[PDB]
Ligand binder design. Structure first.
Ligand code: U1Q
Length: 330
């Protein structure tokens, strides 16, 4: 089998991407944030504290003839932005773009933190990291991809995120029309539960490529590109007026600037992020100071190839016996 679904930026800055997902019988369609950095499929629900729901579409398990409560199971997750959610668990039928998993664990939120409530466009998350990170207790549950993998034509899922435009998540096949050149595959460590790989280096704009190993994760659920302080300083040094702002929480730059591209290495291959992809707009409404899309990982403990990086590429999440990651230009 295969599946294919369109993924769309939630706003004019590509702050995140949502993909429609059918849950239950009859289907209930929720727009979920596909997150290769986490491993829980959780949704806003009929059980979510009312004051914490503000415009999201909810899953109502009592209206699904295929929903079954997973007895005694609870879940609780926290993310790198300080947000969190928790609740109980059902199993139900989940479909993405034509691909169906029966008995998928659907984590129903009883509580969500303020940043989830305040985002009316995201009805939940669909985790696509490794199932070892799933938070369900006392019996850990598998991701949608892990459950579907054996049925797929090929044990892969691909991310083709758009810049200011729709894109595609495919399951079970590689669309060879969706990229230029070839796909370069690179090794993955699953030991932290992430799609953790090692970039071979970087360049800023038209500058010299620096060969240097940068261990990091391919994370569709993180908006920005988080890299070592040395790399980030080298990038922003090329932008007149750019500075690291403690008050704002990262590098800012004049909104009047035209940004240089940023290249990262995948083996001997190169992915070029156009400069415009690095502009995240005014720091506050009407400001002429703009927030940068490349930020230091120093206060994080891991480098993160988030959407800024991934949207410049066609990315293969290869769940073969030995998982790997593939990147192509597009
Ligand atoms: N980096 C993040 C932040 C929030 C979330 F839900 C997932 N990933």
């Amino acid at each position: 089998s295969t599946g294919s679904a369109t993924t769309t930026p939630i706003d004019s800055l590509d702050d995140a991407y949502i993909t429609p997902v059918q849950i239950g019988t009859p289907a209930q369609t929720l727009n979920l944030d596909f997150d290769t950095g986490s491993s829980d499929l959780w949704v806003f629900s009929s059980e979510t504290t009312a004051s914490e729901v503000d415009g999201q579409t909810i899953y109502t398990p009592s209206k699904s003839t295929t929903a079954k409560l997973l007895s005694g199971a609870t879940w609780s997750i926290s993310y790198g932005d300080g947000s969190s959610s928790s609740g109980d668990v059902y199993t139900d039928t989940v479909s993405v773009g034509g691909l169906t998993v029966t008995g998928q664990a659907v984590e129903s939120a009883k509580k969500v933190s303020s940043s989830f409530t305040e985002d009316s466009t995201i009805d939940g998350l669909l985790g696509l990291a490794f199932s070892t990170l799933n938070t369900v207790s006392p019996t850990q549950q598998k991701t949608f991809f892990d459950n579907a993998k054996a049925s797929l034509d090929s044990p892969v899922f691909t991310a083709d995120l758009g810049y200011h435009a729709p894109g595609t998540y495919n399951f079970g096949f590689i669309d060879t029309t969706a990229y230029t050149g070839s796909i370069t595959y690179t090794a993955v460590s699953t030991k932290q539960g992430f799609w953790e790989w090692t970039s071979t280096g970087y360049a800023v704009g038209s500058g010299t490529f620096k060969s240097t190993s940068i261990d990091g994760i391919a994370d569709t659920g993180t908006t920005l590109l988080y890299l070592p302080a040395t790399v980030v300083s080298a990038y922003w040094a090329q932008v007149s007026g750019a500075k690291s702002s403690s008050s704002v929480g990262g590098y800012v730059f004049p909104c009047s600037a035209t940004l240089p591209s940023f290249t990262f290495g995948v083996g001997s291959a190169r992915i070029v992020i156009p400069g415009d992809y690095i502009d995240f707009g005014p720091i506050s409404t009407g400001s002429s100071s703009c927030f940068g899309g490349i930020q230091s990982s120093a206060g994080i403990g891991i480098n993160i190839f988030g959407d800024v990086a991934l949207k410049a590429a066609f990315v293969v999440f290869n769940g073969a016996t030995t998982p790997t990651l593939g990147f192509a230009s597009k």
